[PDB]
Amino acid sequence: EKSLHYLYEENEKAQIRLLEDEVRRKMSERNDYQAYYYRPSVAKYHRISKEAADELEALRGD
Amino acid sequence: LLRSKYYDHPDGEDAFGKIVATNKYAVSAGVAWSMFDVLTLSKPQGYLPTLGRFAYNTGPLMGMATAFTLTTLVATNARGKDDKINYLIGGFAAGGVFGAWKHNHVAGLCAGLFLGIAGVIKKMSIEQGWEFFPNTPIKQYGGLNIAGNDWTIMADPPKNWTTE
Amino acid sequence: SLTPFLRLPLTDLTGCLINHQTYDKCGKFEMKMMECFEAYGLERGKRECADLISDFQECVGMQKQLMRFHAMRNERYKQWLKGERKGQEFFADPPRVDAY
Amino acid sequence: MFNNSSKILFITIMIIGTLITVTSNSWLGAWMGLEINLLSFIPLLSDNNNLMSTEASLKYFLTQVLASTVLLFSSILLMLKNNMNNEINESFTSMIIMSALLLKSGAAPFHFWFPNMMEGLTWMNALMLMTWQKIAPLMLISYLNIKYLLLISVILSVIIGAIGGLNQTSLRKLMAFSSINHLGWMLSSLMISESIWLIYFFFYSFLSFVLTFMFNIFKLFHLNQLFSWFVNSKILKFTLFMNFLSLGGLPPFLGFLPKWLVIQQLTLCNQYFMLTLMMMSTLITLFFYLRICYSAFMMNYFENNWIMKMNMNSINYNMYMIMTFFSIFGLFLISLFYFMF
Amino acid sequence: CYTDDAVCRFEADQQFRRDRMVDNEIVNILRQRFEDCTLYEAPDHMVKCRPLM
Amino acid sequence: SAVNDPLELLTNKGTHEPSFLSPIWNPIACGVAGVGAAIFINWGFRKPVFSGIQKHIAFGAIGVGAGAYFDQKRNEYLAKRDAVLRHYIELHPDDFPVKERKTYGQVLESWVPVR
Amino acid sequence: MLKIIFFLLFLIPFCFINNMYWMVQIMMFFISFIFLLMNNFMNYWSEISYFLGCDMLSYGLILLSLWICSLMLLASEMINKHNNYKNLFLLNIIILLLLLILTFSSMSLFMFYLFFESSLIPTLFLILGWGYQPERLQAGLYLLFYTLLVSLPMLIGIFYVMNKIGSMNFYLMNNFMFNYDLLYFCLLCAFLVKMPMFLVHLWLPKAHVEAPVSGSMILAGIMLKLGGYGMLRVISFLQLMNLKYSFVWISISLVGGVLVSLVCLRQTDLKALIAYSSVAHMGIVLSGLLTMTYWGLCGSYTLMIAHGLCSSGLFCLANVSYERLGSRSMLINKGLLNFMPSMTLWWFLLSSANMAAPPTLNLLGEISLLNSIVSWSWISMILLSFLSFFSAAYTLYLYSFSQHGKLFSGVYSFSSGKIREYLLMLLHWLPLNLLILKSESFMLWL
């Protein structure tokens, strides 16, 4: 019964390993999810520069 | 004509495209080795022995390429079978031609064994359907918590896009 | 724009150095690309956001407009060399000096 | 290398310039950080007592400014073709960018400056050169998606870096050639992950710190100088030389772990032939590691008898023995690690 | 039982091994019956041992 | 269950009991590593190996604390990975479909004869 | 199990205490007695503790490892008489025995690989540290580079099996079956080098000679059996492809057994002739392994168990003439019946165990191996008769020329035989005849 329990645990670990390999392959195929296989491109600096350029329109004067 | 591959047609279908493909791979390898040859070891002076060393290092590779392709086509068309031992015969022939450039009989066979091994492994790749250098199906661009790793001092302005 | 590997305090200065956001003919195009790169990320933004990429490159890169200008100027010279157009009618009515 | 506080200033500004390089969101601020790193790595790698260090700094200057201007020219060319920093379909300007990065890093078509400069340095500027100065180019190589340049560089790195270290009996050129082979394992990891590269680079850096500290404290620059090195107990000399077997990739010690994670991730990414090409060409690296280990694995030697006291630093060798323990007993910490996943 | 389950494969493999050892003992006892027929019927082993063989 | 549902494979039912060495292995291994590192330092300086036991005590305490802290961070990392896998399985029900389990009796494949 | 592993882990601090050389072998024989007690094993894995478990093949191999290492500390008294580094020798032996126990009680393929290639570094250390030859560098480099060159692509094969299956356990990998040439070559050729082939043997006769006595015990006693254990674990899921490619290895192994048996008739060293003698018997083991029968697998396990004792016992016999006559040359070793007559009992009792002998476990392993190979093909009856005739043609030559004839003139005075050596060659032969009693233990691992 100890070998039966260890075989059941190792078999379930094998199925979860195969399923996470499939999930990681489908995630790297499409680059969909935000955890792995995702390059975070941010426009924070573009919005900061646009806000600064909008702020310096008020500063234009004499 | 010059953009023809080796495996766009089956074995024994066309000769000239296979000759051009294998010979252009041999020319690329010979030029890539000869550029590192004549500047580093046994550096020649003058226009004539530099081109002589380029021919001496490129043309024998062309001869190995066309000899392997010609005896591969001969072994394929001599019978009805298309199997790996035709590539073994072609690798033995290319090793034997390389030996002649060496001028050593031992060098030619010793080379033919390894070239036949490379030929039967490449024909195994063709038959089974896998690639030597495939594209990676998984490419980890980063680890976990890749959104929470933004340690920046600048405050984010509100975005112009929503998910609604 | 390139995604940096590390997001430290030292990217705060380098990031704003070059950008069409300061007044420009079509920085409002680039913003419509850049927020798209916030939506899909950098790698899905190369595929799912290809229509907004080509408009910004067309605007500031000026590729097809200059290619069309060179197609209109080389065809006129080809018509001149082939004998179809000659004399004082080689060049058309010029624009006014303050037209553009 | 701490004879002056100005060198500590150059160290922190080269750290700042490298961090500016690896965090730049554009292809021109990365060049800005590269020039900051170059400015702060010219006075290190230069000294008055050593004659070869000045011409080695000249070689470093010409190699880096040749590579940085080609990197700038190709980045401006990419920006002239498509005005974003990325590229939809990869073309020849990315190839020029990657070749200019490979001249900076020291891949084997462009590696010939690396041991020729290493033949006349000290063991601390070498520690800065093969560890920190590989941060700035390799972290930019991960932004490009061309495969055949990385393939040619990995293959040429693991054959040329392993064969070329056999003739060298100087320890600096041998460590440079060993770092060229360990460079190719990092670029082979870069095609499949950006985290397994960090694993291999961090533990390769760790092995570089613990192995170059053996040659810096005791001032060893030759293979024959290792045989004349006097250790009071020969068991300690035998134990301290296990870092070569550790860095060569042997299973009971650490250093098998990052190579093994590269093997695990490459086989899962269906790349088998390049892995076999690297591992048939990593046995030569263990061969010139075991040629160093001739001087400690035997238990008695025909020593020179004029020196009978072992002279060493205190703080540096105190830092050395912590890292030597984790270089050979560090595989017990695999249960605590969670950064592989 | 199903292909994904390894609990059934261990139990059915163990009863297959047990049935193999039992059937081996069936063949062994049936051979020993023929050997005892050959020893007990020493001149006339040709006729009597034929149903056992 | 007669179905090979992908969502129940990653969902923790709670029937898995952790072992005796699972919560306590990393602090005692890092404590033994710290004690051995102090012994290695004392051996390299030709000191007695148990001379200066305050260094051994400090190295063992640093190892126990670092092992407990990074083991807790490791458990949080694995919990977040499991949540990521469950969320991506839940978000894409077409790419990962429940698959009917098949008895050996339905399949007929390849005995390899040894003979 | 964890009792034996923690026993050796707490026997590690015995090395650092001075004058503690003989207590370690006492505690090693005590833990061998305890391992004789824990024998509740069947064909499946039992005493499952985390990743460590044991079946009958693993039980016999761990018991052989413990007996060979316990006799390995008994054989090396030359390390104790000199001030050669006893603490390092004891630490290397305990670490190597712990790695062998860990790679034999491994539940999975990967931990078996990891401790399997961890085991070659203490063997490297013994060969380059405690040998008595200038060519120890040629000895260890051949061994390490042969095994490493053929075992590195086995790691790619191991993770290809992991990516196709999911698991690392032996039982779950027994269910699957692969039809690939290169996976078969990767997962086989490392063990095909680790047990001696004809073509790939070179590391063996050039690493047995230049090693110490302890390197000879650990190489011919348990590290020609790592490859046998590995093939017994790998062949179960590569049956279709090994049935395609097994005739090449079986023919090469049988002709190489005949040829290496012809080599030993032209050998002038005692320690080299037993080194080539390990090639001939493991050729029969390799030829019986690939037929995949019940009898071939059982007789292969029995012959590896019965060969790891007898080859090591022969290597102790060549050491006690090398310590006294000063050389391993066969011309010098002549007429030792008149020098050591009481040793000649153990020479013939351990040389007869190398061939077919009446009470030994080697005959019960050789009978069950020739059954499978004659069952495999009728053409093998020509070359099994030649191999098993040439085996005692060469094995009687070593006892005959070393232990009979006129005495070698010009030999200086040496010491007589000792009770430790008689005890050392007692425990290499009485296990060979006490294990035919309860032989269903050491044969039926299936």
Tab-separated table of N, CA and C in Angstrom, chain C residues 73 76 85 87-95:
chain	number	residue	atom	x	y	z
C	73	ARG	N	8.613	61.622	-60.284
C	73	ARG	CA	9.685	62.372	-60.929
C	73	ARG	C	10.474	61.549	-61.938
C	76	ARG	N	8.348	61.221	-65.223
C	76	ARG	CA	8.414	62.455	-66.004
C	76	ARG	C	9.721	62.549	-66.788
C	85	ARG	N	7.450	64.159	-73.860
C	85	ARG	CA	7.334	65.469	-73.232
C	85	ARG	C	8.628	66.234	-73.462
C	87	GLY	N	10.358	70.523	-74.408
C	87	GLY	CA	10.172	71.952	-74.563
C	87	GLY	C	9.902	72.685	-73.266
C	88	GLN	N	9.108	73.753	-73.340
C	88	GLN	CA	8.773	74.543	-72.162
C	88	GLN	C	7.660	73.927	-71.326
C	89	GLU	N	7.016	72.865	-71.810
C	89	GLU	CA	5.999	72.152	-71.052
C	89	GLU	C	6.566	70.941	-70.323
C	90	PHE	N	7.889	70.898	-70.130
C	90	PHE	CA	8.503	69.820	-69.359
C	90	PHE	C	8.115	69.902	-67.890
C	91	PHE	N	8.054	71.108	-67.338
C	91	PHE	CA	7.631	71.319	-65.965
C	91	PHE	C	6.287	72.033	-65.944
C	92	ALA	N	5.453	71.665	-64.977
C	92	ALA	CA	4.076	72.136	-64.916
C	92	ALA	C	4.013	73.538	-64.309
C	93	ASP	N	2.808	73.963	-63.951
C	93	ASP	CA	2.592	75.265	-63.330
C	93	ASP	C	3.165	75.213	-61.918
C	94	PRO	N	4.136	76.067	-61.573
C	94	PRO	CA	4.737	75.987	-60.244
C	94	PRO	C	3.791	76.514	-59.180
C	95	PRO	N	3.911	76.036	-57.942
C	95	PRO	CA	3.055	76.542	-56.865
C	95	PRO	C	3.468	77.941	-56.438
